[PDB]
Amino acid sequence: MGRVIRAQRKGAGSVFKAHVKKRKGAAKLRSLDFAERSGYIRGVVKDIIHDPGRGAPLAVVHFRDPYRYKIRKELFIAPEGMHTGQFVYCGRKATLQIGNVMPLSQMPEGTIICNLEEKTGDRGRLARTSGNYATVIAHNQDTKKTRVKLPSGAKKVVPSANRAMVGIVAGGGRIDKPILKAGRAYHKYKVKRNSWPKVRGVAMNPVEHPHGGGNHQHIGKASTVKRGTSAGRKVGLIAARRTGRIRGGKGDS
RNA sequence: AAGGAGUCUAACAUAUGUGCAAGUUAUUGGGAUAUAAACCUAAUAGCGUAAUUAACUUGACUAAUAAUGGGAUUAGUUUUU
RNA sequence: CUAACUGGAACGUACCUUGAGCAUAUAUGCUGUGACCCGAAAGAUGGUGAACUAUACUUGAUCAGGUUGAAGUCAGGGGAAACCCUGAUGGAAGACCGAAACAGUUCUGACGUGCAAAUCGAUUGUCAGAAUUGAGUAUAGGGGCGAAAGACCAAUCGAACCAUCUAGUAGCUGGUUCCUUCCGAAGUUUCCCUCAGGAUAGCUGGUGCAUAUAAAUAAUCUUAUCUGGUAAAG
RNA sequence: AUAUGAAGAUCAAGGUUAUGAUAUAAAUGUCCCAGUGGGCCACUUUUGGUAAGCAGAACUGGCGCUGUGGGAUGAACCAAA
RNA sequence: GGUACAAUGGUAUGCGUAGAAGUGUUUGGCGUAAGCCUGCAUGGAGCUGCCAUUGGUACAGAUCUUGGUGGAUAGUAGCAAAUAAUCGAAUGAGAGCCUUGGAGGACUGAAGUGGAGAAGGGUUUCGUGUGAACAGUGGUUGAUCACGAGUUAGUCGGUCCUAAGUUCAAGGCGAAAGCGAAAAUUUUCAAGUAAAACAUAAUUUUGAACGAAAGGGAAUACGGUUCCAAUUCCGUAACCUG
RNA sequence: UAUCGGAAGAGUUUUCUUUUCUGUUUUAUAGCCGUACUACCAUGGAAGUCUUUCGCAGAGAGAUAUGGUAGAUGGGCUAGAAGAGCAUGACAUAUACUGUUGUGUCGAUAUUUUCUCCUCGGACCUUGAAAAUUUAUGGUGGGGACACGCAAACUUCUCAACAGGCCGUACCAAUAUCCGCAGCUGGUCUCCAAGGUGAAGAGUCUCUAGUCGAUAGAAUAAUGUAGGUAAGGGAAGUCGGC
RNA sequence: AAAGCAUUGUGAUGGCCCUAGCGGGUGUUGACACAAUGUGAUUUCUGCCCAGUGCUCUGAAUGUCAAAGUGAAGAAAUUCAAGUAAGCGCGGGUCAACGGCGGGAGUAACUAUGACUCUCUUAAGGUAGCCAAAUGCCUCGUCAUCUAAUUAGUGACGCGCAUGAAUGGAUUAACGAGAUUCCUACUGUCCCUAUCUACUAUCUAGCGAAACCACAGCCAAGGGAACGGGCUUGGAAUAAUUAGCGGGGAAAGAAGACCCUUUUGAGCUUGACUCUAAUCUGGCAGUGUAAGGAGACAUAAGAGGUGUAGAAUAAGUGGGAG
RNA sequence: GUAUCAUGAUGCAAGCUUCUUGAUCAAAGUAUCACGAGUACUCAGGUAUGAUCCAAUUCAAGGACAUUGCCAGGUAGGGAGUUUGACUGGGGCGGUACAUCUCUCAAAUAAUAACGGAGGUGUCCCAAGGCCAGCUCAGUGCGGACAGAAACCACACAUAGAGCAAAAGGGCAAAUGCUGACUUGAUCUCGGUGUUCAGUACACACAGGGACAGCAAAAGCUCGGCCUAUCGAUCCUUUUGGUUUAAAGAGUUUUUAACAAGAGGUGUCAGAAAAGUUACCAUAGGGAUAACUGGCUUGUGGCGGCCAAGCGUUCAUAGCGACGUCGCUUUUUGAUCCUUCGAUGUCGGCUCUUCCUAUCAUUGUGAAGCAAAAUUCACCAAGCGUUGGAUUGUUCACCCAUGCAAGGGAACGUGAGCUGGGUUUAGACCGUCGUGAGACAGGUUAGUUUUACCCUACUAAUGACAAAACGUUGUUGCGACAGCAUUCCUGCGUAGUACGAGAGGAACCCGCAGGUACGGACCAAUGGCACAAUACUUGUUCGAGCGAACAGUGGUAUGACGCUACGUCCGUUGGAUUAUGCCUGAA
Structure with missing residues (x-):
């Protein structure tokens, strides 16, 4: 045979849960x-907090309930x-x-949005995530489909009744600090999951x-393998259109 | 020191024993009783008495009296001189 | 006319040429059954384990004494300014030395039918950390788990353990149990995924049977005849 | 062109079975019966190999399977089973 | 062809507590041989010759199997890590021990060899008695052996709460077992009432339970007491819950 | 823990030593008064900036200052406390079934080394549990209460009466109670923690407590195992300063 | 392992992974994320190659080409026939994908050397570097250094068996129970051994195993299954024992873990032979309601269709002889 | 409320929460009946409204697509199972000795082996088959213009010297060769035989019978190739063939089947369908089989003896010694496969002992082209000796050095003697190779070395009963036998002597004085070890004070006795006589 490889085990559950x-x-x-x-609803921010693992801060906002008689508490x-x-x-x-959140039709074009x-x-x-945003590219006024530009470079079409909150997200930009320290990536990942010290397969x-x-x-x-090559073979480069270092300008805009 | 390794069974072959012999074998059953034995027995069936051919067909000479017809080699026989 | 029968052959045959069989016993022999007895590494099915160890989670616990002296702060000097320079303060760092604890380098020391199926002694590694640790909990076998050695998953691991299938199979090793009498081998042939093995023929024995108060034949020489290309000869 | 061939089937006529020595009784079937299918040594002849207590063959005799006498000793030599 | 073993069918008007089988043996033999017959000694209730037919039928070997035993060897195997005991006394059958008490030299040296707990253990605790075996020497002692006893709570714990997680609940699925599902299934699947009016009327579905003697979590301390138990008994003074 | 005094005993005394030693205690619970530090309140208005820490930290968003409030954090007085009880100590009373007199007092260290309480910080691409349980507040209704006095109060106040079931609990916790086949140099979670030296929970030595349990005795050959020392030389040894 | 570096996939009806089936993990997720891999701090750089292989592309549409559907022949079975989906083939991209990175002659005033020329080829001919290296066979290379003496060390050199750039090249401070060399200090490592201590061993009293064993146990020579304790011939041969010892007993331990053989296995690999999960692709079903183009099949119908001749031009016209 | 509208038409917009970390939950109002106990009075709820109305499908994206169900193609070492020939002077590698043909081996019938030797086969052929007739071939000689070494024509000789698809062999001349003639017998059938063999098969050959045909006037006998090679089962598929047999209820046609004869193919050729790697490995065995020891063997090296070309000024052998020749030597080194695979520990070094002589040195000698010195050759000869280092795991060789002088080997000597550096398991890295797993006889690094207490042997220790040239128990002796030990160098004198033209030069013989190594003792001196004797001293402890204690010897210092070297003392003597030189002395 060979045994079940370390990629195939992460989906099974146990030590690989979040x-x-x-x-x-x-x-x-x-x-x-x-x-x-129909209109809007006012909320009040009560604290800014830190989700463990998630590098962006969260905000605890207190709305009132319009039908019940309590206070809703939204993250x-x-x-x-x-x-x-x-x-x-x-x-x-x-x-x-x-950071108001409103439908994507009530925005001007070029508006920077998140969530x-x-x-x-x-x-x-x-x-x-932390430091990331979308951009209202242009509406298509009826057919009601805004096009947004997403943090991938990729440019997607949404509808125009869905909501987004204005503004970049806080906590940017985390990724410029070097970690410097294997024990500081330990600490990064012990609130996330068992993506390991990733031992290389060429060493196994x-x-x-x-x-x-x-x-x-x-x-x-x-190391580039076919798309439908079906685990536990799909290792290396999964259906790779091209490899090597890019020497060229293929930002897609 | 005790235990410890060519067996049982199915099927066939040759050989020898035994019974009956164009036969043979009741042994699945049924009877009759005396006891898992022994006894009697119907109708079948197996094998044999007829083969061959892929099959369809066909099927072993006029011995009512010639052992295979004929020949050769032939133990024996009031044979027979 | 539609039809059947009739003539001569040759060749073939597990057939015929006036029945010999069937039932039963016993020995031998071939075959299939655990198959003379013992013996694998395997392979299948269903179960059992994370009391060791691995990793993860929850909730706890614990780690002398020193060394060193990062930013921040203070007071001085100096300079047109920019800003430098001296003292202190302070007490960061997967920093150092080392006790506990955790580890296992070296002696290739002791011991090596041991105190011990991994220990003893001395040296050494780390010691506030990606540190050590208890209980609970998760992950289970072609599965897990792995800072990765095919490591570890109860002294078991390049597929754990248990029970069954299973008396698995073995052209291979080993053993195969009373006496006397008589006869007495083979290591060659052909063929085989055959070369440590068969089947085959030869060699052996047993059991008969056909012929006992020549001119039947059969085997080494002489005779007759045919054959031969080796020694020698050239 | 011979119902003279050539084969065959019959009657005729033929002293003294036509070298030697032998007769372990020979003949013929069946169990295709068991074991065996590694051989090895020697004279003589041989091939390969520098050679070999090496490799490979022909011939007959041996050991295997065999004691005993001789070669001090010894599978095989000499003698004798 | 012959001999050993066990049986079955016949048979010997067989043998036997006046001594069968077995065993032992310088009793005497027979057989080429396997083996057989016999005397004596032990033994105490069954057994043999013949004809047939048999069968789990004969052992030296299998690093055979079970059991027992010998040398090696009464030992140059060994009982040498953790410093160490000695005097005198009593007891006793016997004393270096653990047996005791006295004196004395020493060690652990408190990160302990001290004092308590958690796992685990399960009566080992304690008193008296003690004989073999066990304590790899001894043993009068013992965690051994016999007998008798011993563990007391409103306050210490459990129990209650949840964690990580787990077991089940019919969406489901599967031939089923069961998912090495995690079901999140599920018409009102859950609450609520000094309980109502032209629906009585306001509201909520993750069902359920388990999982911590270290997390969370009401309330107690002292002095005394026993051969053996104590935040538990006794006395005293409090406290919590209802 | 250590110093120094007082009262009461003890130890040494050839010589010294107003010596050396020992003990010299006060639970839970509760009434009081105060304090470490922190926040706050009133007054008032700060540059010539000031208050302040080991550290920085703070102030026209109100400093310094003076006076108050809260947190009874963590302590002293009293009650428990019966010259209690306890402990040290002077007599008396035979097991004849018991009484008694005295003590229990001052001061002050430094515990970076223990435990708690409070403060103020830091590291972090790491931000450091949940639920029962409990309280305060707010809200609409609804409940009560009336003076010529009778009351009240699941009453968040004080006291009284009654009750508190089940199960564990002994002992060991390891050189002999557990796992390793065993009375096995192995392994196995915590709590307390004296003095001297000293930087020290080091090493060495000691007090409390504990133990002398590791078969003994004789002798001290070879070879060993562990430990020393060595003239002159100095790695010539060795694969290699092992 | 790491930090740094780079590549890949993925905007969710997604990527990756589990699952028998239902369904789940990542996911209390959302590109500064999740997942997949290589390289391995910093510094300095990361040359050329898309021929082979892998990966990839609305994209190349017709070479291949499944079942279903459709057409034809036959009495039917059925045989032929078109059009056919992915994949392949053809085309493009890609090397911090897997990997690779050449020879032979002739020439400069003594010789020597080859800046230069010609040519054969390749997808590209190994660049920057570096080197007898933990990588160089020859080999103990050659030169220097280190020593009295160096197959070792270090520095160079370079046609480099067979170095080479994220298959990472060249370095590099600090760090290391890593490998190596030299000098100092130091010593019993040595010359070259001696002695001292503890505990053994030892002797005793008590207590008491095991491994092992054909029989056993002095050799020399011979012969022998080619190295005897035993046989043959010699030499020789006296009990019972103590502590040592490590020549022998081809000593013990353990059915050689090396080699071979077995028509015995296992682990792993790969396009070995044959399969398979998953995936992609087509078809059918569930599967409905419409419009507009559809190819007007067929139907509710309609007219027209052209030899000599004759009334001419009867698509055709016979019943018909008014 | 804005364009647009004289007050309405009419599109467009809206009807309300954005200065601030408060708070909101439970309807007030009107509307409407209610107008009820009490007598004018304490004293009351519903519905609508507030909060417009009607629809209904909780909204939102997809949507007849996805998904799913079932077939079809493709992809797929993710995964499964299985296989990877034999032979073989071990296996892998090579090859094919595997099916076959000829010559030889092969030993005069036939048979006959090796990975013996020399080759051949897997085809070619409408003629190169069949048959008649005619013809003579290799070469050679004399000739014939161009024309020669060869062109062609022609004569004479030609035993096959040619030719025959033939690899080799046999065979062959009015042929089996060359040329023409017609031709299809390279046909149909049925057995039988030879070879190989088991007396099986195929296949190849043969000899016949039955046809039908070719050539020839005819006899003739043509059944492929002049002869010896040129090839293939079952099952399957597929033709030809009867003018067929069956489909089992019966006819008819299609289909299928069956039977006869071919073809399609198994080259491992009597005929599975088949790739690696394992250093992570397992099992059964094997000394039928390698790796090391032991045995035989010696091509390779060297060491000897004959002959003497010659070298050596002259001289064949003072010293050599060509071309030949005959031996010895296995250890390197092959070759071998006999013993061992239920296991003989596998390189070196260290340690330690013994043995050989193939003699380096020394003793005793002989010889030189030997004056002396130094050397060379040889003889008797194995007694003593044959060292310290640098580099390498080495083993030889080399290097520094000492040395009068620096010989070669044996028990593969020696791992329960050690060490563990080489080599050699699992970890790891690089270079080349491989697609990969992996390989390397290339490098590198790290990697458990077990047991004696048995018997001998050896080394030391005791030692009885008996037998006894004779008791017990002491004392003094004896020697058989076994062991066996000393050794080389130096310096002075000899002596600047002999010798030599000189230079150089006998440390000659002998005498003397020492040293090396080894041996056997010893302790007066000196050196080393510590009466744990004594002094000091650190920490603790005893109230202080001592020739107290503890710290497994606290530490330092000196340190008798004793042990001990690094010191001291001691270390021998005769006989037969080998090699050689002679005497006497012949045959």
Whole structure:
């Protein structure tokens, strides 16, 4: 045979689950009730907090319930510049200021946004890491499909009734500090998951990896593998259009 | 010191024993009783008495009296001189 | 006319040429069954284990004494300015030395039918850390888990352990149990995925049977005849 | 062109079975019966190899399977089973 | 062809507590041989010759199997890590021990060889008695052996709460077992009432439970007491819950 | 823990030593008064800036200053406390089933080394549990209460009466109670923690406590195992200063 | 392992992975993320090659080309026939994908050497560097250094068996129970051994194993299965024992873990032979409702269709002889 | 409320929360019945409204596509199972000795082996088959213009010297060769035989019978190739063939089947369908089989003896010694496969002992082209000796040096003697190779070395009963036998002597004085070890004070006795006589 490789085991569960014990509670926008469609709803920021693992801060915002008699307590993903004690307005008639969240039709073009809904009403699925944003490229006024530009470079078409919060997200830009320290990546990852000290497959044994094995330590065959090559072979470069260093300008804009 | 390794069975072959012999073998059953034995027995069936041919067909000379017809080699026989 | 029968052959045959068989016993022999007895590395099915160890999670616990002296701060000097220079303060760092603890370098020391199926002694490594650790909890076998050695998963690991299939198979090693009498081998032939093995023929024995108060034949010489290209000869 | 060939089938006529020595009884079937299918040594002849207590063959005799006498000793030599 | 073993069918008007089988043996023999017959000694209730038919039928070997035993060897195997005991006394059958008490020299040296707990253990604790075996020497002692006893709570814990997680609940699925599912399944699947009016009327679905003698979590301390138990008994003074 | 005094005993005394030693105690619970530090409040208005820390830290968003509040953090007085009880100590009373007199007092160290309490910081692409449980506040209704006095109060106050079930609990916790086949130099989670030296929980030595348990005795050959020392030379040894 | 560096996939009806099936992990996720790999701090750089192989591309459409569907022949079975999906083939991209990176002659005033020329070829001919290296066979290379003496060390040199740039090249401070060399200090490592201590061993009293064993146990020579304790011939041969010893007993341990053989295995690899999960692709079903182009099949119908001749031009015209 | 509208038409917009970390939950109002106990009075709820109305599908994206169900193609070492020929002077590698043909081996019938030797086969052929007739070939000689070494024509000789698809062999002349003639017998059938052989198969040959045909006037006998090679089972598929047999209820046609004869193919050729690697490895065995020891063997090296071309001024052998020749030597080194695979520990070094002589040195000698010195050759000869280092794991060789002088080997001597550097398991790195797993006889680094207590042997220790040229128990002796030991160098004198033209020069013999190595003792001196004797001293402890203690010897210092070298003392003597030189003395 050979044994089940270390890529195939991460999907099975056990030691490869996410370390969600001290995480703070699933940040997402409000749900599109009636004030998010007819007018707006005022919220108050109560604290800014840190989700463990997630490098962007979160914000605890307190809305009132319009039908029940309690106080809703929403986790958001922090726009940079959001501070405690400030008001957040969510709705159709939100004014354009950070960090209001309003539908993507009530924005001008070129507006920088974060926490964008992929499909409408699904409470915040796009551009929500640390330092990242989307950009309203241009509406197509009827057919109602805004086009946005996403942090990949890629340029996607949304509808225009879904919501996004104005502003870049806070906590940017984390990734410029060197880690310097294996023990500081230990600490990075012990609140995330068991992506390891990633031992290289070329260092393993032929049982445990396609690349493992030889006397000298080499891949031995092409590292770009077919798309539907079906685990536990899909290692190396998964369906790679091209390789090598880019010597050229292929930003897609 | 005790234990410890060519067996049982199915099928066939040759050989020898035994019974009956164009036969043979009841042994699945049924009877009759005396006891898992022994006894009697119907109708079948197996094998044999007829083969050959892929098959379809066909099927072993006028011995009512010639052992295979004829020949050769032939133990024996009031044979027979 | 539609049809059947009739003539001569040759060749073939597990057939015929006036029945000899069937039932049963016993020995031998070939075959299939655990198959003379013992013996694998395997392979399948269903189970059992994370009390060791691995990793992860939850909740706890614990790590002398010193060394060194980063930013920040203070007071002085100096300079047109920019800003330098001296003292102190302070007490960072997967920093150092080392006790506990955790480890295992070297002696290739002791011991090596041991105190001990991994220990003893001395030297050494690390010691606030990607550190050590308890209980709970998760992951289970072509699976897990791995800072990766094919390591570890209960003294078991390049597929754990248990029970069954299973008396698995073995052209291979080993053993195969009373006496006397008589007869007495083979290591060659052909063929075989055959070369440590068969089947085959030869060599052996047993059991008969056909012929016992020549001119039947059969085997080494002489005779007759044919054959031969080696020694020698050239 | 011979129902003279050539084969065959019959009657005729033929002293003294037509070298030697032998007869372990020979003939013929069946169990295709068991074991065996590594051989090895020697004279003589041989091939390869520098050679070999090496490799490979022909011939007959041996050891294997065999004691005993001789070669001090010894599978095989000499003698004798 | 012959001989050993065990049986079955016949048979010997067989043998036997007046001594069968077995065993032992310088009793005497027979057989080429396997083996057989016999005397004596032990033994105490069964057994043999013949004809047939048999069978789990004969052992030196299998690094055979089970059991027992010998040398080696009463030992130049050995009982040498952790400093160390000695005097006198009593007991006793016997004393270097652990047996005791006295004196005395020493060690652990508190990061202990001191004093307590958690796992685990399960009566080992304690008193008296003690004989073999065990304590790799001894043993009058013992964690041994016999007998008798011993563990007391409103306050210490458990129990209660959840964690990581787990077991189940019919969406489901699978031939089923069961998912080495995690079901999150599921018409009102859950609450609420000094309980109502032209629906009584306001509200909520992640069901459920387990999982911490180290996390969370009400309340107690002292002095005394026993051969053996104490934040538990006794006395005293408090405290919590209802 | 250590110093120094007082009262009460003890130890040494040939010589010295107003010596050396020992003990010299006060639980939970609760009434009081105060304090370490921190925050706050009132007054008032700061540059000629000042208050302040080991450190920085703070102030026209109100410093210094003076007077108050809170946190009874963590302590002293009293109650428990019966010259209690306890402990040291002077007599008396035979097991004749018991009484008693005295003590228990001052001061002051430094514990970077223990435990707690409070403060103020730092490291971090690491930000450091959840639930029962409990309280305060706010809100609409609704509840009560009336003076010529009768009351009240699941009453967040004080006291009284009653009750508190189940199960564990002994002992060891390891050179002899557990795992390693064993009375096995192995392994196995914590708590307390004296003095002298000293930087020190080091090493060495000692007090409390504990133990002398490792078969003994004789002798001290070879070879060994562990430990020393060595003239002159100095790595010539050795694969290699092992 | 790491930090740094780079590449890859993925905007969610997604990527990756689990699952028998349902369904799940990442995911309390969202490109500064998740996942897949190589390289391995900094410094300095990272040459050329897309021929082979792998990966990749709306894209090349017709070489190949499945079932289903459609057409034809036959009484049917059925046989032929077109058009056919991915994949392949053809075309493009890509090397911090896998990997690779040449010879032969002739020439400069003594010789020597080859800046220069010609030519054969290749996808590209090994660049910057570096080197007898932990990588150089020859080999103990040659020169220097280090020593009295160096197959070692260090510095150079370079036609380099067989160096070479994220298959990373060249360096590099600090760091190291890593490998190596020299000098100092130091010593019993040595010359070259001696002695002292503890505990053994030892002797005793008590207690008491095991491994092992054909039989056993002095040799020399011979012969022998080619190295005897035993045989043959010699030499020779006296009990019972103690502590040592390590010649022998081809001593013990352990059915050689090396080699070979077995028509015995296992682990791993690869396009070995044959399969398979998953994936992609086409077809059918679930699978409906419409419009507009569809190729007007067929139908509700309609007219027109052209030899000599004759009334001419009857698509055709016979019933017909008014 | 804005364009647009004289007050309405009419599109467009809206009807309300954005200065500030407060708070909001439970309807007030009107509307409407209610107008009820009490007598004018304490004393009351519903619905609508506030909060417009009607629809209904909780909204939103997809949407007849996805997904799923079922077939089809493709991809797929992710995964499964399995296979990787034999032979073989070990296996891998090479090859094919594997099916076959000829010559030889092969020893005069036939048979006959090796990875013996020399080659051949897997085809070619409408003629190169069949048959008649005619013809003579290799070469050679004399000739014939161009024309010669050869062109062609022609004569004479030609035993095959040519030719025959033939690899070799046999064979062959009015042919089996060369040329023409017609031709299809390279046909159909049925057996039988030869070879190989088991007396099986195929296949190849043969000899016949039955046809039908070719050539020839005819006899003739043509059944492929002049002869010896040129090739292939079952199952399957596929033709030809009867003018067929069957499909099992019966006819008919298609289809299928069956039977006869071919073809399609198995080259491992009596005929599986088949790639690696394992250093992570397992099992059964094998001394039928390698790796080392032992045995035989010696081509290779060297060491000897004959002959004497010659070298050596002259001289063949003072010293050599060509071309030949005959031996010895295995250890290197091959060759071998006999013993060992239920295991003989596999290189070196260290240690330690013994043996050989193939003699380096020394003793005793003989010889030189020997004056002396130095050397060379040889003889008797194995007694003593044959060292210290640098580099390398080495082993030889080389280097520094000492040395009067620096010989060669044996028990593969020696791992329960050690060491563990080489080599050689699992870890690892580089170079080349490989697609890969992996390989390297290339480099590099790290990597458990077990047991004696048995018997001998050896070394030391005791030692009884008996037998006894004779008891017990002491004392003094004896020697058989076994062991066996000393050794080389130096310096003075000899002596600047002999010798030599000189230069150089006998450390000649002998005498003397020492040293090396080894041996056997010893301790007066000196050196080393510590009466744990004594002094001091650190820490602790004893109230202080001592020739107290503890710290497994606290540490330093001196240190008798004793042991001990690095010191001291001692270390021999006769006989037969080898090599050689002679005497006497012949045959």
